[PDB]
Design brief:
By secondary structure, the chain is of the alpha+beta class. The protein has one domain (about 1-265): Beta-lactamase. It has helices at about 5-15, 45-60, 95-105, 105-115, 120-130, 160-170, 175-185, 195-200, 245-260; strands at about 20-25, 30-35, 40, 70, 90-95, 155, 205-210, 220-225, 230-240. Strand 7 (about 205-210) and strand 8 (about 220-225) form a beta hairpin. Helix 1 runs antiparallel to helix 9 and helix 3 (about 95-105) packs across helix 4 (about 105-115). The radius of gyration is 17 Å and the shape is globular. The protein binds cyclohexyl-hexyl-beta-D-maltoside. Cyclohexyl-hexyl-beta-D-maltoside binds near residues 1, 199, 200, 224 and 252. Cyclohexyl-hexyl-beta-D-maltoside binds near residues 1, 200 and 222. One of its GO terms (biological process) is beta-lactam antibiotic catabolic process. It catalyses: a beta-lactam + H2O = a substituted beta-amino acid.
Length: about 260
């Protein structure tokens, strides 16, 4: 593979889309690669990580419990509810809802949690509280992936999302237990985690959340590093490409290959 920045450029040429990317040291915040890092991209389902950061903040404050059982109804369900559709009779805990949202991309779970933090406006207020003045959520889980040209709703930037993830995971805004929980949810992603491990060389750590939307939108927030360590945050978003899902996945993977082959920078 070529150098990361050359590979990112090649991905734009091949996809005819915009790529946004940051590579950042998790422990320090050192930015290593940046590309379109202040441009806006739809978050898609990557928002579910920040959502559960907001939930954990409420837990830390004594305003929520991960144990608390929420008993919802079939009319509450939205498209793609692989876990939540199974628990109409018995409900799910707040922690189970976060696990379903992050590890399975369960949309009803996400919406149930989103209302607990005050909806899109409440999650946006939480982002402002932690010093992210850019990321914004405007819609609910099944409408926020529309990725209309020119539409600022439901967007982040690579730089903002990376900084926000670092804040949630490491800055002691969340309690130690909550930081550990958020990280474990990402480690446990079932949608892409096992597939990524299947193509990573031995020794490379992965934790992640992916997203997909219209007009080719695709993204991943991840922790990656050699020696089985979460050394770096990597955030990659794609927008405005007509390419197949397979090709969008392959281009993201190719950026990953470039980082892996050329890690010491
Ligand atoms: O010299 C480094 C390595 O180079 C190759 O590894 C290949 C690997 O066989 C392939 O499957 C992967 O594809 C990349 C798959 C990446 C998956 C997604 C990455 C994510 C992670 C972070 C968020 C953005 C994207 O490339 C690497 C690097 O060339 C060799 O196979 C391996 O034995 C050697 O250790």
């Amino acid at each position: 593979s070529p150098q990361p920045l050359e590979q990112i450029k090649l991905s734009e040429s091949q996809l005819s889309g915009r790529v946004g990317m940051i590579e950042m040291d998790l422990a320090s915040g050192r930015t290593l690669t940046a590309w379109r890092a202040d441009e806006r991209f739809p978050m898609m389902s990557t928002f579910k990580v920040v959502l559960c950061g907001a939930v954990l903040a409420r837990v830390d404050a004594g305003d929520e419990q991960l144990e608390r059982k929420i008993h919802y109804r079939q009319q509450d369900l939205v498209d793609y509810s692989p876990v939540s559709e199974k628990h109409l009779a018995d409900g799910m805990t707040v922690g189970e809802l976060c696990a379903a949202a992050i590890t399975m991309s369960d949309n009803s779970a996400a919406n149930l949690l989103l209302a607990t933090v005050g909806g899109p406006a409440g999650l946006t207020a939480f982002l402002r509280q932690i010093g992210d003045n850019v990321t914004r959520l405007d819609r609910w889980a099944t409408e926020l992936n529309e990725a209309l040209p020119g539409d600022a709703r439901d967007t982040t930037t690579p730089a903002s999302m990376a900084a926000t993830l670092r804040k949630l995971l490491t800055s002691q805004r969340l309690s130690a237990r909550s930081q550990r929980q958020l990280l474990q949810w990402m480690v446990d992603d079932r949608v892409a985690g096992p597939l990524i491990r299947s193509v990573l060389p031995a020794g490379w750590f992965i934790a992640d959340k992916t997203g997909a939307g219209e007009r080719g939108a695709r993204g991943i927030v991840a922790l990656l590093g050699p020696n089985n360590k979460a050394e770096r945050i990597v955030v990659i978003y794609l927008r405005d490409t007509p390419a197949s899902m397979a090709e969008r996945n392959q281009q993201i993977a190719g950026i990953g290959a470039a980082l892996i082959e050329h890690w010491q920078r």
